[PDB]
Design a binder for these strands. Structure first.
Ligand SMILES: [Mg+2]
Ligand SMILES: [Mg+2]
Ligand SMILES: [Mg+2]
Ligand SMILES: [Mg+2]
Ligand SMILES: [Mg+2]
Ligand SMILES: [Mg+2]
Ligand SMILES: [Zn+2]
Ligand SMILES: [Zn+2]
Lengths: 103, 132, 343, 218
RNA sequence: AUAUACCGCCAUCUUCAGCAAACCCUGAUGAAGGCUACAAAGUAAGCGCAAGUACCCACGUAAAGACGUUAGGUCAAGGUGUAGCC
């Protein structure tokens, strides 16, 4: 659904819980510290890459300025500064999309 | 160090039966013989056939009552008549039990040209002597 | 011959070769293992390639209240039943051999970030599902013996916590991995270390200590700071229930001494309420978000002191050249501030 | 909840079971409780309880002695009125007969013989899954024959049990909850402590029985 | 062919007496150890020893003789994993 009612729909609450979306995702990478820049994108030529980020794997989710409670959990409620893409677990493409969306 | 018809001591998670536990040198001291015939006695004969066809009986009945028994058998051959005694569990149906009873008894009688009988003792869970 | 044939379990033993030189001494083999299989449980006792229909075992004995008769299974029916049995065996084999996905903790093939779930209930009966467990370290200790020689003894260290400031670590040694896990879990759930925290997510103030040639420094931080600490430290913080701090470890690196000194410091940290009770002064917190406003946090339970503390100028205080450098900004390192994983 | 009210009633009262009238410094000096081992037998943590020394012999502070003894008797009688289990220990063989006799007379129990390893820690496997471990430990002799701290104080400090031991100049009152300075070796002191504990626990029991009888009436 | 896959069966110290699941404790919670009887942290399942059984006894002799070492011997008692002739 293009609107944001998929969030209020119960599949979201049973699939996530009280935690954020990024909390479920985890990165597979080299030893020790991970890379400092996430992948360029998760989808290419109508094809998804292995180990995609949550916003990209859940196609029903739609990033937009209006879904305030969907894009609020990334930025700290107590610190107005957004987290970085290696933190949130998402690729740089949708990360930048969400940055201009929140702005 | 001798290894003969004996169970190795494990951590303590191996239920064992009386004969399955006890050693083969107490067969007369703290056990009984599985079979009772006279071919072993002096003057008799055909003991080789007795033993061979007893082994065959044990194997055949073990494999025609598979998964139900929980111990070795008891042979009892009085003159002509043969008797076998077994212990089994009660997971399958008495229908199958009696059907196989009749089938096996008829096969044994027709094969050995001998009157034969067989008895079974039901158990919910196989009796264990010790935890080895 | 049929007399030469025998039962199953002995053939299974002879094929698996559980006992031998191959396994003894711990040399083992090149990770080839034929798994146990049970053929007798699978197929029903009734049917063979000759498809006689048995009313006693293979078919229900009565039909329409009418006795049944011995009958023959046709060619196509026998073949279809055999195909169904082939499919069933394939299904069983697939379900037997599959992937096993234990959560990736600190890294693959490592017992660092894995939880075994809460401890088992006590004998008197005490279920502690609220407790969550983690495994700090797993190592293979080896001591020799005259009889056998090199015998391996798995040593493991574990920690458990509520997430409510109450936790505890322990150690467990045994020849078996699962048994050592269980023993260490019981020892931890018995031996508990509780610690207080300031606002449910931070320590009371910055701490610095050493323990067995192991220097550690805890640094209090405000909200939204995160847990940028050693992996063991962040695991124990998750278990305790504190959500953000900083910690630095230098000198030697040994996990058991690390945890021991950590619990020692976090237990010796003195509550500011008791500090005011001992001093006779009111606590006052000041933030960067909040302006010049005195935030009273605690007061002495006893009577307030009459006169205030005298100002302490140029006090004798031991501190860290590293923090001095970081405060002056002269410090440089590529490895200090990175975009590490989430918390 | 009236049961909880009755349980809490003795708390707010101070000297509620009349334990003070039992003892006085006269009786202590008569029983020679003020004695102490030589200065060579002195102990750091025992320093503050030493009022002084003479002829290389140490003297106990009798005011602090009476204070700690009052607190000990009050605590003992409190959980006796609460039916809290009590357990006596004394490794000294000099008074095993007397200790066991007075334990029988009181109804509370004791262990004078050799203490076994982990008798308290592993008591579940020793005795059974369901066993009510004691609620208070007390010590007529804190140290053993070789003069080490008896393992029972360690066991109690571990498993959260309160402890009340009479501490001599050689003893370690750190682990004890209500350590009462005194004379471990003198038979006068031993008999005095025996009679005091007997009277105390007996009065606590009698008071419990009369309170519960009054409640049954009401 | 592989006893260097093994089962099964035995030599070995053994003309030993230790082996030990399951708990606790000490060492700063390390590898490890846990003994003092006028006794100080060890408790012990179970196995074995032993006892009893066999010969003429209760002694004696046989039998029994664990945990493990020798990648000990034996794919040739027999079967069987792997690789081969087929
Ligand atoms: Mg021999
Ligand atoms: Mg990996
Ligand atoms: Mg060899
Ligand atoms: Mg013997
Ligand atoms: Mg012999
Ligand atoms: Mg060899
Ligand atoms: Zn993407
Ligand atoms: Zn003394």
């Amino acid at each position: 659904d293009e609107p944001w009612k998929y969030l209020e729909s119960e599949e979201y609450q049973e699939r996530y819980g009280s935690r954020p979306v990024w909390a479920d995702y985890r990165r597979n990478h080299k030893g020790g510290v991970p890379p400092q820049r996430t992948r360029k994108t998760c989808i290419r030529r109508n094809k998804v890459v292995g180990n995609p980020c949550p916003i990209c794997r859940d196609h029903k989710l739609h990033v937009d300025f209006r879904n305030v409670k969907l894009l609020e959990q990334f930025v700290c409620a107590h610190t107005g500064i957004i987290f970085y893409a290696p933190y949130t677990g998402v690729c740089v493409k949708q990360h930048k999309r969400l940055t201009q969306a929140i702005q | 160090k001798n290894r003969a018809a004996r169970v190795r001591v494990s951590k303590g998670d191996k239920p064992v039966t009386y004969e399955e536990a006890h050693a083969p040198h107490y067969i007369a001291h703290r056990k009984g013989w599985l079979s009772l015939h006279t071919g072993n006695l002096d003057g008799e004969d055909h003991a080789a056939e007795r033993t061979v066809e007893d082994v065959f009986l044990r194997k055949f009945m073990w494999g025609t009552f598979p998964g139900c028994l929980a111990d070795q058998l008891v042979l009892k051959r009085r003159g002509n008549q043969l008797e076998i005694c077994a212990v089994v569990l009660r997971q399958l149906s008495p229908h199958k039990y009696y059907f196989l009873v009749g089938y096996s008894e008829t096969l044994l009688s027709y094969f050995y040209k001998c009157p034969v009988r067989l008895h079974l003792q039901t158990v919910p869970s196989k009796v264990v002597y010790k935890y080895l | 011959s049929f007399f030469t044939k025998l039962t199953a379990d002995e053939l299974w033993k002879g094929a698996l070769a559980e006992t031998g030189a191959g396994a003894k001494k711990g040399r083992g083999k090149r990770t080839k293992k034929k798994k146990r299989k049970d053929l007798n449980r699978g197929q029903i006792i009734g049917e063979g390639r000759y498809g006689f229909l048995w009313p006693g075992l293979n078919v229900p004995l009565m039909k329409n209240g009418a006795v049944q008769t011995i009958a023959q299974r046709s060619k196509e029916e026998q073949e279809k039943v055999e195909a169904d049995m082939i499919q069933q065996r394939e299904e069983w084999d697939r379900k037997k051999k599959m992937k096993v996905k234990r959560e990736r903790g600190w890294s693959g093939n490592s017992w660092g970030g894995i939880s075994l779930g809460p401890p088992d209930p006590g004998p008197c009966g005490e279920t502690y599902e609220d407790f969550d467990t983690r495994i700090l370290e797993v190592r293979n200790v080896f001591t020799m013996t005259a009889k056998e020689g090199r015998k391996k003894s798995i040593r493991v260290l574990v920690a458990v916590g509520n997430g409510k400031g109450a936790a505890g670590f322990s150690i467990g040694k045994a020849t078996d991995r699962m048994d050592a896990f269980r023993k260490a879990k019981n020892r931890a759930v018995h031996h508990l270390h509780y610690i207080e925290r300031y606002e449910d997510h931070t320590i009371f103030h910055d701490i610095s200590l050493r323990f067995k040639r192991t220097h550690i420094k805890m640094k209090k931080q405000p909200k939204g700071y995160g847990l940028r600490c050693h992996r063991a430290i962040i695991t124990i913080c998750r278990l305790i229930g504190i959500k953000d701090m900083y910690a630095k470890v230098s000198g030697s690196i040994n996990m058991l001494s690390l945890t021991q000194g950590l619990f020692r410091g976090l237990s010796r940290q003195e509550t500011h309420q008791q500090l005011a009770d001992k001093k006779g002064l009111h606590v006052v917190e000041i933030r960067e978000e909040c302006g010049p406003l005195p935030i009273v946090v605690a007061s002495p339970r006893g009577p307030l002191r009459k006169d205030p503390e005298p100002e302490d100028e140029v006090p004798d205080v031991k501190l860290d050249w590293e923090d001095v450098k970081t405060a002056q900004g002269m410090k440089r390192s590529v490895w200090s501030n990175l975009k590490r994983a989430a918390t | 909840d009236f049961n909880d009210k009755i349980l809490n009633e003795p708390l707010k009262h101070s000297d509620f079971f009349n334990v003070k009238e039992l003892f006085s410094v006269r009786s202590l000096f008569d029983a020679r409780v003020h004695l102490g081992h030589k200065a060579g037998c002195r102990h750091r943590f025992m320093e503050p309880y030493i009022f002084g020394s003479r002829l290389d012999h140490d003297i106990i502070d009798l005011e602090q002695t009476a204070t700690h003894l009052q607190l000990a008797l009050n605590f003992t009688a409190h959980m006796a009125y609460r039916k809290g289990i009590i357990l006596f220990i004394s490794r000294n063989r000099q008074f095993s007969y007397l200790i066991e006799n007075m334990a029988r007379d009181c109804g509370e129990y004791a262990h004078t013989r050799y203490f076994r390893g982990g008798m308290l820690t592993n008591a579940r496997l020793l005795f059974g899954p369901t066993v009510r471990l004691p609620d208070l430990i007390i010590f007529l002799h804190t140290l053993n024959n070789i003069f080490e701290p008896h393992v029972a104080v360690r066991d109690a400090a571990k498993m959260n049990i309160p402890t009340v031991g009479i501490v001599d100049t050689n003893c370690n009152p750190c682990l004890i909850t209500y350590p009462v300075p005194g004379n471990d070796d003198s038979p006068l002191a031993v008999h005095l402590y025996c009679r005091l504990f007997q009277t105390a626990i007996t009065r606590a029991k009698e008071k419990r029985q009369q309170v519960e009888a009054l409640y049954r009436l009401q």
